[PDB]
Amino acid sequence: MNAPDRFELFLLGEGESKLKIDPDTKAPNAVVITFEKEDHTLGNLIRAELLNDRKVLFAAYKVEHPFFARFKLRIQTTEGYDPKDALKNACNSIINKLGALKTNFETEWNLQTL
Amino acid sequence: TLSHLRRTNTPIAKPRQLHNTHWGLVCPAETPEGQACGLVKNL
Amino acid sequence: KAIPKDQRATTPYMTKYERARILGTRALQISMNAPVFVDLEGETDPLRIAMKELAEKKIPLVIRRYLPDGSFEDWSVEELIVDL
Amino acid sequence: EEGPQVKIREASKDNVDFILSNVDLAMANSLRRVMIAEIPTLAIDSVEVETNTTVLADEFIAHRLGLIPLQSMDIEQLEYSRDCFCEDHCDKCSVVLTLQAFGESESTTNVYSKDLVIVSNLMGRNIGHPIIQDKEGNGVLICKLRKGQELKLTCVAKKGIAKEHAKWGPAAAIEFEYDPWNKLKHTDYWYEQDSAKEWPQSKNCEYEDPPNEGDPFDYKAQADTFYMNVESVGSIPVDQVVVRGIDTLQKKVASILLALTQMDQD
Amino acid sequence: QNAQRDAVTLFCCLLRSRLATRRVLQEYRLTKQAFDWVLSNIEAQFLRSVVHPGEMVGVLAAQSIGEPATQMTLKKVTSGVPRLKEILNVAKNMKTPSLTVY
Amino acid sequence: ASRHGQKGTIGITYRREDMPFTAEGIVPDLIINPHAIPSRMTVAHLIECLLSKVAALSGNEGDASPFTDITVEGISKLLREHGYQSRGFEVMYNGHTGKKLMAQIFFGPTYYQRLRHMVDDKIHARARGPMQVLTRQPVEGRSRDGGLRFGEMERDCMIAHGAASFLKERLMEASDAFRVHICGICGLMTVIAKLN
Amino acid sequence: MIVPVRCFSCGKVVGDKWESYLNLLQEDELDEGTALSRLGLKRYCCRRMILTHVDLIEKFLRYNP
Amino acid sequence: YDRKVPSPTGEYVKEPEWVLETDGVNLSEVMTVPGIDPTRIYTNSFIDIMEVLGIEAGRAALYKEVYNVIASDGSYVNYRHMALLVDVMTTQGGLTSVTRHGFNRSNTGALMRCSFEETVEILFEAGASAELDDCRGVSENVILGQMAPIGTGAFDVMI
Amino acid sequence: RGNLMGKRVDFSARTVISGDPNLELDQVGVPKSIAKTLTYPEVVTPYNIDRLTQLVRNGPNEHPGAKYVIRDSGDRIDLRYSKRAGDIQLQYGWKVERHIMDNDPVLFNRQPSLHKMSMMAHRVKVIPYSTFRLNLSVTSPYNADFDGDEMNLHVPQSEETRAELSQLCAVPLQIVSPQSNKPCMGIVQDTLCGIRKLTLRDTFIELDQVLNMLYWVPDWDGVIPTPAIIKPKPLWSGKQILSVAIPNGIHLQRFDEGTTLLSPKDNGMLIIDGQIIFGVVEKKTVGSSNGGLIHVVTREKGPQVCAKLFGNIQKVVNFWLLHNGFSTGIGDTIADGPTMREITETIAEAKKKVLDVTKEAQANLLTAKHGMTLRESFEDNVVRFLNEARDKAGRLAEVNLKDLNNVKQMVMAGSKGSFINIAQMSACVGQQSVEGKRIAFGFVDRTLPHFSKDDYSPESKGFVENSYLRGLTPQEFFFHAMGGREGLIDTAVKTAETGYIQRRLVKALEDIMVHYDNTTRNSLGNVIQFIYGEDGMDAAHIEKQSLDTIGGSDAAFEK
Amino acid sequence: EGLVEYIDAEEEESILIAMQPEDLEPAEADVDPAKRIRVSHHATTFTHCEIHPSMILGVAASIIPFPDHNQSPRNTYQSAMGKQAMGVFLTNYNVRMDTMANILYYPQKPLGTTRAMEYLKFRELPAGQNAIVAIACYSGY
Amino acid sequence: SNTLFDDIFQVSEVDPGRYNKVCRIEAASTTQDQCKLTLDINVELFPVAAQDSLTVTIASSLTRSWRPPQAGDRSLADDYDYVMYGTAYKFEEVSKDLIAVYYSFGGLLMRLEGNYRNLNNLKQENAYLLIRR
RNA sequence: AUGGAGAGG
Ligand SMILES: Nc1nc2c(ncn2[C@@H]2O[C@H](COP(=O)(O)CP(=O)(O)OP(=O)(O)O)[C@@H](O)[C@H]2O)c(=O)[nH]1
Ligand SMILES: [Mg+2]
Ligand SMILES: [Mg+2]
């Protein structure tokens, strides 16, 4: 009766960009991206992979309220390394592990019985 | 429903206290709280 | 009759009830687009303005403090200290 | 092959017990989530009812209809109705099916999901057929009729995501376990006298080496191996729940990549 | 001026007991530009701490006694709610009169 | 509410994925706080849980009849032959993150009951609306689209705060403000104000 | 009312299991735990969906209309 | 009873005394008794303390009592409140109860008293005695729907 | 009383309330449907006309919009049914009754309204779903839980009337309360239970987890603090990141018992400028105590910073706790084998001791304590012997509960539960009691028809030997029920009587205020106090400092 | 056949009731440390024997599992709330025209029961479902 | 700057005070007879038996946010085994010829007792306590 | 509008 529709978790709305990038005012060379219509599924995956990049000083995400499918990613990189690239290499890195994971699973499946 | 058919009313010196003699006739536990506590009873 | 401006016995400080009623009254004046005596800076909120308009002592209201006997001390919002 | 590593232990129409070596915890988790809420499926999502003189209420039935697992193998070539340019539904984006039941007998007439009859044009796509793992071939007991009772209704199956309703959930259960000797000290075992004698041994302990008291705490170690078991309802074969899961996760990681390029424009 | 000296008495005991020379210099080790501040604050903080005229201070007192009285529920004397009810009623005939003799 | 005076309302809904989970994929339908347990001494709730889990596994009916020789020990031995840890604990994994839980969770079946008290049946707000004839104040009751009552106990609370204009407003512009005419002499509302 | 289209907890489909359950009981004299196991209802989250279920429909059909 | 008292050497110490506790009260006569410290004798009956030792000793006793109700319950209310309560019962001259017999006689605004207890009988002989109402009581302005002289309404604003 | 001292009123709302780990203290979750019904008359002015026009545009559905409009003549234009709802050109000086929006000031209430902190101005945040939401830490002044309680909300109509709420009634400026000169809001339940969990000397956090916690506090400077542990791994102590929540220049010292500045038991507390130095953080620090964090931070940094402080602590502890987890089984009410056998034999040596005294008093060798009947002494002794038995077996049990025992840990944190709870659940429930005495003889000379007459034994008069864990027997059950009922009956009756005392109190001190001569008076101007409280101070700004002239050797005073 | 009598409160006054049949001797005449502590048959002069102690309870408390392991007022609260639980209040609900009627979609016979539940028909007309439930602090919601 | 203090201690007492990741340690200096040490040690990281002997140093370097361990090329300033960073909170005077310092490494505690030490120790903020074996 | 019954915190 006051409930939001359930598509509102994955469907974007009236002029809501998927990513929103803002210059962090606190620490230098840091940025805080807002991910509309996403959750711990994404955020935890991006933040954990950003932690493997050794030119990333800081990386953490957070769902400010569970009512809303959205989350903030905060990223700080070493001087000269633009944080967006830190995000880009991060995503790609995941995609490559995932692909390898898929094929590796397939070949394993193609060897079974029942 | 089952309950409401086996109810007791008691209008108006210690009428609310679950009294010894109630053993086996009235339920120790089942009674309204607040105003009618211990006055309304269930068999 | 009234009381002398010297020999004013009450607190030279502004009571919290004086402040709320002052901010209230100005924000009501601001609300109905009466003239505004500050820079604004982008404050479009009638209460936030009177707050800035008070911080700069530019509020031209006077307080009439009542004493239990019918006496009364007048204080300008100009002169009342605002430490709260 | 290269990175993350799979090792089936058991496989079946309904289950894949495997081991997922060389992966982040985060990824092995994010995969299980996706497997639960984000691989799309077809399921009844509208019921127009013509007659229901049955003991049950309209929507009460309508509800169960939603829960009946429909074949979703070729789902990727059906469309989201919200997407498709037709008004309401069509044949590109929605399967329509019919249910007719009338009690003839004296005995109670049952209504199964076998009694569901596809009507719209599947056009070759492997879609919409109610899953039936039942042994006598009538999976799921929709409703029961007395003598004069009738039930006549029409259901439009749509492509949906379990995030939106748990009907469109391809996964049933997704067993999941790492470090079966707490060698990472990720829990602190509650006990009374003895952690070891009181907590039972995970079946995944024949697969790892028990720690030695002669050894101290390995603090550098991370979570590496993962023992999952995906069980499927059947609207998608098992192997596919995991694959499409990895596919979808990857797919949505990607739209983030693309979205970064979309912003760069002047 | 006598009311004023009175009101302030107990506080100043605390003031003089702590802002006494031996202590300022041997326990704290304060200075001048810093000790003048400590004086300054205390002045300001104090002036703040005064109650503001026009404070409905009765309703405040009644509520401040009433509310925790609603949290009273359970050997000699009558205590708690019944006792309170005796007190405010000026019970001519109370339930546990007693003398305490020294 | 469970069967033992542990009542309480929903605060949020989480979908399976965000829920904590057992290592066999079991997930709760329901999460109650451990703080409802130790001050209300409803140990029964705790035992019913333990018995119920055994009943489910064993496929028997848990006898929770009162005065008998059933025993948290006896039940616990039974649940142990069923391979789970004997006091109802189970390692659970956080759903957000996939990491284990430091703590093990008391987890099992427990007969819970939905009570006639629903949110959508209580909700009510009113801006301005009906006004009784006699007093010209807001009518009483949600079912009547009425105003909530600013009681004396509320009136005092405003008085405490020192909110004078608010207290006036509550008792004038909401509710029943009204304009009469008096006489410069008598002082009664006697005047025949032939307005206009 | 009537069997559940699916288990609330896990999501498994327990709706096709009802008749088969009732048969395992009475036809070949099995006990409910064994019966529930043969139906491959292993985890107790979906095991109680069947055991704890009551078929009130059988009563509802009793009424003529 | 245990008792803290100053040592010959300055520090405070535990020097436990003997104390007599009573069922019943006749303060008038047990304090005049030889053998006891008549400077420290006490009843829980502040109603007698008021009679024997005077209105101000009573006020102090009435507080001591009220205080003890709270603190025995674990609680702790600040002294200014209970004091105001006490002092209010007390300023009339004796013990003024918090009932229609107590404060609700005290010649305050007629409209004010009619808002508690005897509602009409107050309004009636206020009509007969032809009373005049200051209208500086809170509850009178509540009735009149005017801003009450409370806090923000305790003064006047001008230019 | 029904239509004058109190009147039904417009612009009001009510619903079931629920808690929210993510609202800020002074906020109030308002369901959209309510936001859309309640109005504020906002006057058209150059500063607002853009937003104001847009609102009328958005009509009355859905938020944020507006219902009606008020023209110069004072007519009432209705956005619902109007052939001009589309194109209306707002004149300066017109009223636009808009919806209630974010950061509107609204008076929030729960009845019975006992003290002022039961009507506090909150900041509106419109949310989905049908319940009012508040921060758990505003729970207490409201006495509100989430087992079905409803709360009211009133919306101010004028510019001043909103001032009056935000300047006088706002939740931050009620945090420290003149009632008990202390804070009336603190860290409760989960947050409380976990904050102790988080700060044990065993509690370390590795990098990944630290950065989330860090990012979780909004007021974070974005400076990773140097990890307490570096070689050969960075573990960050619980105490360390929690400190991020606490502001600067916040000094705190607490010596609780064996506290000796090495805190071999992590006792007491010590916060040297916004960093905690030693000691487990629990109720005595972050509760609503007297010389605790909330009292300090309010006075030191102001209400605003303190109100902000509530959020930050909950945001971190909750996050940390969410991935640590906490639970309670029946395993937490099992005492050792050994401890059980001792508990039983303990109960017996008191059953054997009552036996004697009874045997003794039956031989007429019992001597009545001065000023009491022979029987009175006998009861008094037996009741003491059995009470002692309980407390003794309780403590017996409490000692056997480990530190990982969950019931213990809530008692440790101070979250919920106490000794008796542990005692009765695990060892022995104790002696039942009605009207102050043990269970009477309802039937002649006996207590139930299953006893022989004249049976003063402990079991016969209502001593529940067993524990809740073990299980009360028939007679035990029945007696326990008898006592239990008394509870209910006078709980019911305590609510009745209290509610009268209050009304009376209030009506008697109603018109007492401090006038502009510091002289507490009343409608007649009668002096009640000559200086408010005998010292002129407001009770909020007052704390318990020791006057250390008073104590010690004359010698050391001199020194 | 005089095997069973009817006693009212007054005649109850004049008799000696045993709580357990075996309490007769029987004849008596090492233990489980986990069972509750039971006094003995110390009165060897009975006249009647309680049918079964659980019958002291009414219709609502007869629904509570293990009520003899609960603080007594909680048992009372349940007894109030059970009357507000939704479920199948009668099988003929489709043919009645009540102002307000609530029926549970999938009611469930509780996993832990009471012998007295049998005569109360609770297993056949339940009101409550057997939720899988965790006691845990999770999101703090 | 440079070093602050360095000695070699012998462990006399190790104490799991109802803990399993921390011990309160008691050591004396094998050089000064007027010198003992009390220290809270993460024994799950760097275990410490009784009768051990541990080289102990107090240095203040190697504040800006802690970059991860990019010591790949930097100057670790250690080659020790165990290293915490604490705060100095109390400096205590035991005897005209004795002085004690009080450290808090994230609530792990340290008490050092000696006399010439006074000519080195600062009142925070820094102080990396390094231990070897 | 009366009057009444049950229930919520
Ligand atoms: N003034 C009144 N308040 C009541 C009344 N009945 C309930 N309440 C209120 O409900 C609040 C809590 O009481 P509950 O309804 O939760 C019953 P109880 O005290 O047994 O709950 P627990 O605190 O869990 O022990 C109490 O503080 C009151 O504000 C009543 O008749 N009058
Ligand atoms: Mg309560
Ligand atoms: Mg409540």
Ligand SMILES: [Zn+2]
């Ligand atoms: Zn289409």
Ligand SMILES: [Zn+2]
């Ligand atoms: Zn006239």
Ligand SMILES: [Zn+2]
């Ligand atoms: Zn299931």
